[PDB]
């Protein structure tokens, strides 16, 4: 529940060490999905995080609605393809690989 | 040399670079800790019973060479020729290639901390160690032995650091990895027989204990007593070094490791972790400098019968070195590391070595029926060469029946390639043979300035 | 005359020629120059190699709510023993890291987890 | 459930297992550049690139409803037909679509593998939209990675 410029402060400075990445839940906060809204989540993380840092992506979690109930059954496969083709570390909540 | 300095040359000879490379490949074939310590103890029995049979053959015949005067006395010229051929192109250059490859695993490992070095770096550094040793030993014959005693002192120190610091950790209670040591294992004939190839590489040198440890104060009693004491005591130092590896590593962490003793020195000796890649790298080129002293001894005694070329075992006029033999060993060892890969050169070495250890020990039993009245001062009981020649056909047939790879074809075809050269240059001396052999000897004589060794049989 | 097995006294009359001095000196100085190139190729690749990836950058993470994964002692709750019996399923998903949420000894198991003992596992 | 989806070749579990294995075996997907194109109301198109490897991955993901895509108007130098590496409908794996007309259903994703030597992060018109962590090139002769880019 934070702005993007405050989340990227947990990456640290080029001379001070901090968290390896802050966890990214901005794709979990999409209740409706679109071509403009997915572009806005991806580009805001890549433009605001410091250069040479490692990104990460989540599409669900224990505090989020599950994906096939949040977006529909037709978006289960395309959001798993988005998770594994983006740069960084994909994080999978349990049951997302099945479509619970 | 008394008895105590008789067993000190045995311990210094048998401890080599093997204990720093072999624990990964014994555990890779017997996947549990418990069977991994039994193979390390059963290999020290094959080295002790094998060296006792060579102790009887050494006093019965009393001729220079290797196993070459032993095979001639038992079977005749044809197995003696095939041993001189296989030790030229298979046995001796592969032993020089495994040692120089083991040197480059321990220099490149601390620079690639959590990942493997690429294969181009371990091979281009191993070829630089072959060409450096092949030129230093071909120029300065006495320089190799001044540095030889500080390379043996660097080897026993880093062995004693691992043994002592492993018994300290074993007293504090780091014994969790030994708890279920026999759960998940292999009684396949190809998993055990390749675990014996890698353990017996760490004992390499038991078949040449005869020539240097027979200038004692009382032979025929102190030679077989230095073998029963010396080789079981290095077997205790090899088990205690594997016990020390399993106090800080799980059996899965040891398989996921580039050099096994660097990973040990990174979890125990933390502010001084660089002494293990430093001392093993000194002790490994000292084991490669030591094998270039022996270059030309078997080549001279095989060429005196017409079983080997005489342009080899020539001596340089300046820098009185066996320069055509050292250069010949450096060329074939460099060819062998382009396909490369320790765990694929050790199988290639152990297949040809144990084919001729088995023919030699069988010749001890053949000469008990054929070559009596021959004054055996040492005489082992007959059950010892029978067990050593039954394991020697188990260590030859079981890899080529159960787990056949391509090296057991390239080793058989290189040994049977020599059987063609016997029947064209030795058995059926033709006309076109010596008019190829003499201009090559003449033109390689003016190129390297090498002469026949103004010598006698000895 | 050079026959086959020349001694020292006959060899020096011919090894000092031009056609045997320069292919001996070239081949020697092309060997110690191949040692210096093979070391300078070894140091150049080690110095120019990148730092290869850590384990948390290599593969995906798998987040497990441990009460809802696998019950092994037929009490209705997922336990840590049930996760251990399903590790073959997780490696078949090509997963590198397992992320387990809060299993400490707690009075409250929601609302950011009020914890009673930070060094104990909850008995469920 | 897990047990029935292991015997279904069109299941969500089988696509996840193919995507995570492709991510583990390809240097383009776990290390390479990320170069995105312009925004659109329907679809998201980006590429994964690495200098030294002479092929790219083109990911096309439709998040609107059913539409037709002309990929010639987004990436220059493409052939008349492209082969599918991976699809969200697993029946269309290894098939061939045409570049000028690509029919994307609602919720469809495609991964193309395209052999080329013109990477987008080397073109200065696309450099503003390309990103890396742990930058390295690839030498196919030596089979190493090196940083002297
Ligand atoms: C691809 C598979 C095959 C590969 C074959 C590659 C062959 C490359 C040969 C490279 C030889 C390198 C020699 C230089 C090493 C110097 C080492 C050293 O320290 O020397 C001290 C020694 C001391 O001399 P000083 O400097 O005067 O004291 O220096 C030399 O002896 C240099 C003489 C070079 C010796 C060249 C030997 C090459 C023999 C080739 C014979 C071929 C005949 C084939 C005929 C077939 C007919 C059927
Ligand atoms: C400095 C290094 C080079 C110098 C030493 C190598 C000599 C270079 C030429 C090599 C041989 C040239 C053709 C053979 C000429 C002699 C034939 C003959 O009639 O022998 C009479 C010869 C006696 O000649 P004598 O010395 O004049 O009495 O009879 C024998 O020695 C029988 C045993 C033959 C041993 C052959 C050795 C072959 C060495 C090359 C091995 C090639 C495979 C390398 C490994 C494969 C790749 C991994
Ligand atoms: C789901 O349950 C059904 C029925 O309980 C299983 O289907 C068949 O069940 C009969 C028993 O009446 C077995 O004899 C058959 O072998 C079952 N079919 C198959 C193909 O095995 C079914 O196996 C269960 N599991 C699923 C669908 O994954
Ligand atoms: C791509 O993004 C741009 C920039 O956001 C969009 O262009 C305008 O966006 C603002 C708000 O972001 C709207 O109020 C305007 O109506 C947009 N202009 C037009 C002509 O639509 C653009 O719509 C986006 N989508 C595309 C190009 O498909």
Swiss-Prot record, chain A:
Localization annotation: Cell membrane; Apical cell membrane
Tissues and organs where the protein is expressed, per its UniProt entry: Expressed in the brush border membrane in the kidney (at protein level). Predominantly expressed in the kidney, small intestine and pancreas. Weakly expressed in liver.
Subunit structure and binding partners: Disulfide-linked heterodimer composed of the catalytic light subunit SLC7A9 and the heavy subunit SLC3A1. The heterodimer is the minimal functional unit. Assembles in non-covalently linked heterotetramers (dimers of heterodimers) and higher order oligomers; the oligomerization is mediated by SLC3A1 likely to prevent degradation in the endoplasmic reticulum and facilitate heteromer trafficking to the plasma membrane. Disulfide-linked heterodimer composed of the catalytic light subunit SLC7A13 and the heavy subunit SLC3A1.
Functional summary from the UniProt entry: Acts as a chaperone that facilitates biogenesis and trafficking of functional transporter heteromers to the plasma membrane. Associates with SLC7A9 to form a functional transporter complex that mediates the electrogenic exchange between cationic amino acids and neutral amino acids, with a stoichiometry of 1:1. SLC7A9-SLC3A1 transporter has system b(0,+)-like activity with high affinity for extracellular cationic amino acids and L-cystine and lower affinity for intracellular neutral amino acids.
Disease: Cystinuria: An autosomal disorder characterized by impaired epithelial cell transport of cystine and dibasic amino acids (lysine, ornithine, and arginine) in the proximal renal tubule and gastrointestinal tract. The impaired renal reabsorption of cystine and its low solubility causes the formation of calculi in the urinary tract, resulting in obstructive uropathy, pyelonephritis, and, rarely, renal failure. Hypotonia-cystinuria syndrome: Characterized generalized hypotonia at birth, nephrolithiasis, growth hormone deficiency, minor facial dysmorphism, failure to thrive, followed by hyperphagia and rapid weight gain in late childhood.
UniProt protein name: Amino acid transporter heavy chain SLC3A1
The encoding gene: SLC3A1
Interval of the full protein contained in this chain: 387 to 486 of 685
From Swiss-Prot, chain B:
Biological processes per GO annotation: amino acid transmembrane transport; L-cystine transport; neutral amino acid transport; protein-containing complex assembly
Effect seen on changing residue 94 to M: In CSNU; partial loss of amino acid transport activity
Keywords: Amino-acid transport, Cell membrane, Cystinuria, Disease variant, Disulfide bond, Membrane, Phosphoprotein, Transmembrane, Transmembrane helix, Transport
Alphabetical list of Pfam families matching this protein: AA_permease_2
Effect seen on changing residue 453 to F/I/M/W: Decreased amino acid transport activity
Segments passing through the bilayer: 3-26, 34-55, 82-108, 119-140, 141-164, 189-209, 223-245, 274-296, 323-341, 342-362, 382-402, 406-421
Membrane-protein topology: Multi-pass membrane protein
Primary residence: membrane
Topology, Cytoplasmic side: 56-81, 210-222, 297-322, 363-381, 422-458
Result of altering residue 208 to A: Reduces amino acid transport activity
Catalysed reactions listed for this entry: L-leucine(out) + L-arginine(in) = L-leucine(in) + L-arginine(out); L-histidine(out) + L-arginine(in) = L-histidine(in) + L-arginine(out); L-arginine(in) + L-phenylalanine(out) = L-arginine(out) + L-phenylalanine(in); L-cysteine(out) + L-arginine(in) = L-cysteine(in) + L-arginine(out)
GO cellular component, one term: apical plasma membrane
Result when mutating residue 304 to Q: In CSNU; decreased amino acid transport activity
Disease: Cystinuria: An autosomal disorder characterized by impaired epithelial cell transport of cystine and dibasic amino acids (lysine, ornithine, and arginine) in the proximal renal tubule and gastrointestinal tract. The impaired renal reabsorption of cystine and its low solubility causes the formation of calculi in the urinary tract, resulting in obstructive uropathy, pyelonephritis, and, rarely, renal failure.
Family: Belongs to the amino acid-polyamine-organocation (APC) superfamily.
Protein's recorded name: b(0,+)-type amino acid transporter 1
Lineage: Eukaryota, Metazoa, Chordata, Craniata, Vertebrata
């Amino acid at each position: 529940a934070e702005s993007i410029d405050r989340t990227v402060m947990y990456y640290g400075l080029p001379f001070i060490q901090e968290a390896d990445f802050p966890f990214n839940n901005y794709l979990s906060m999409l209740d409706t999905v679109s071509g403009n809204s997915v572009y806005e989540v991806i580009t805001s993380w890549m433009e605001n995080m410091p250069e040479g840092k490692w990104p990460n992506w989540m599409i669900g979690g224990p505090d989020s609605s599950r994906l096939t109930s949040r977006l529909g059954n037709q978006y289960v496969n395309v959001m798993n393809m988005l998770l594994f083709t983006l740069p960084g570390t994909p994080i999978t909540y349990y049951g997302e690989e099945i479509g619970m | 040399l008394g008895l105590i300095s008789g067993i000190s040359i045995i311990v210094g000879t048998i401890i080599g670079s093997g204990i720093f490379v072999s624990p990964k490949s014994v555990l890779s074939n017997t996947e549990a800790v418990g069977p991994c310590l039994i193979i390390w103890a059963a290999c020290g029995v094959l080295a002790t019973l094998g060296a006792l049979c060579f102790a009887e053959l050494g006093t019965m015949i009393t001729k220079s060479g290797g196993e070459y005067p032993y095979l001639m006395e038992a079977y005749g010229p044809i197995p003696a020729y095939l041993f001189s051929w296989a030790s030229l192109i298979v046995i001796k250059p592969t032993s020089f290639a495994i040692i120089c490859l083991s040197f480059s695993e321990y220099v490149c490992a601390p620079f690639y901390v959590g990942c493997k070095p690429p294969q181009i770096v371990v091979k281009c550094l191993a070829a630089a160690a072959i060409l450096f040793i092949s030129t230093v030993n071909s120029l300065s014959v006495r320089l190799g032995s001044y540095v030889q005693n500080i390379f043996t002192a660097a080897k026993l120190v880093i062995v004693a650091i691992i043994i002592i610091s492993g018994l300290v950790l074993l007293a504090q209670g780091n014994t969790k990895n030994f708890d279920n040591s026999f759960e998940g294992a292999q009684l396949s004939v190809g998993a055990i027989s390749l675990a014996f190839y890698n353990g017996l590489w760490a004992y390499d040198g038991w078949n040449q204990l005869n020539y240097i440890t027979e200038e004692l104060r009382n032979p025929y009693r102190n030679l077989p007593l230095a073998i029963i004491i010396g080789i079981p005591l290095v077997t205790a130092c090899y088990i205690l070094m594997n016990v020390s590896y399993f106090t800080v590593m799980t059996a899965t962490e040891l398989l996921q490791s580039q050099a096994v003793a660097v990973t040990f020195g990174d979890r125990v000796l933390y502010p001084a972790s660089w002494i293990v890649p430093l001392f093993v790298a000194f002790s490994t080129i000292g084991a490669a400098n030591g094998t270039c002293f022996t270059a030309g001894r078997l080549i001279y005694v095989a060429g005196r019968e017409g079983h080997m070329l005489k342009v080899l075992s020539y001596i340089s006029v300046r820098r009185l070195t066996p320069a055509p033999a050292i250069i010949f060993y450096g060329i074939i060892a460099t060819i062998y590391i382009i396909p490369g890969d320790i765990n694929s050169l050790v199988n290639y070495f152990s297949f040809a070595a144990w084919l001729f250890y088995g023919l030699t020990i069988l010749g001890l039993i053949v000469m008990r029926f054929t070559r009596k009245e021959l004054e055996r001062p040492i005489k082992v009981p007959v059950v010892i060469p029978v067990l050593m020649t039954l394991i020697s056909v188990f260590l030859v047939l079981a890899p080529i029946i159960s787990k056949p790879t391509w090296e057991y074809l390239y080793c058989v075809l290189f040994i049977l390639s020599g059987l063609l050269f016997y029947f064209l240059f030795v058995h059926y001396k033709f006309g076109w043979a010596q008019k190829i052999s003499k201009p090559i000897t003449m033109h390689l004589q003016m190129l390297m300035e090498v002469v026949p060794p103004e010598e006698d049989p000895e | 005359q050079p026959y086959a097995g020349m001694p020292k006294e006959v060899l020096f009359q011919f090894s000092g020629q031009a056609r045997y001095r320069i292919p001996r000196e070239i081949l020697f100085w092309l060997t110690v120059a191949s040692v210096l190139v093979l070391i300078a190729a070894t140091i150049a690749i080690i110095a120019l190699s990148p730092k290869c990836l850590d384990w948390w950058q290599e593969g995906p993470m798998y987040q497990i709510y441990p009460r809802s994964f696998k019950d092994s002692n037929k009490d209705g709750n997922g336990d840590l023993k049930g996760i251990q019996d399903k590790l073959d399923y997780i490696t078949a998903l090509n997963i590198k890291t397992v992320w387990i949420t809060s299993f400490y000894k707690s009075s409250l198991k929601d609302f950011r987890y009020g914890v009673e003992d930070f060094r104990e596992v909850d008995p469920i | 459930n897990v047990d029935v989806q292991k015997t279904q070749p069109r299941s969500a579990l089988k696509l996840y297992q193919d995507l995570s294995l492709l991510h583990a075996n390809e240097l383009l997907l776990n290390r390479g550049w990320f170069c995105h194109l312009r925004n659109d109301s329907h679809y998201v198109v980006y590429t994964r690139e690495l200098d030294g490897i002479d092929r790219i991955f083109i990911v096309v993901l439709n998040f609107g409803e059913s539409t037709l895509l002309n990929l010639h108007n987004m990436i220059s130098g493409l052939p008349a037909k492209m082969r599918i590496r991976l699809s969200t409908n697993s029946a269309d794996k290894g098939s061939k679509v045409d570049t000028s007309g690509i029919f994307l259903d609602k919720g469809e994703g495609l991964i193309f593998e395209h052999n080329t030597k013109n990477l987008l992060h080397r073109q200065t018109a696309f450099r503003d939209r390309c990103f890396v962590s742990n930058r390295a090139c690839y030498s196919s002769v030596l089979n190493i990675l090196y940083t002297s880019c």
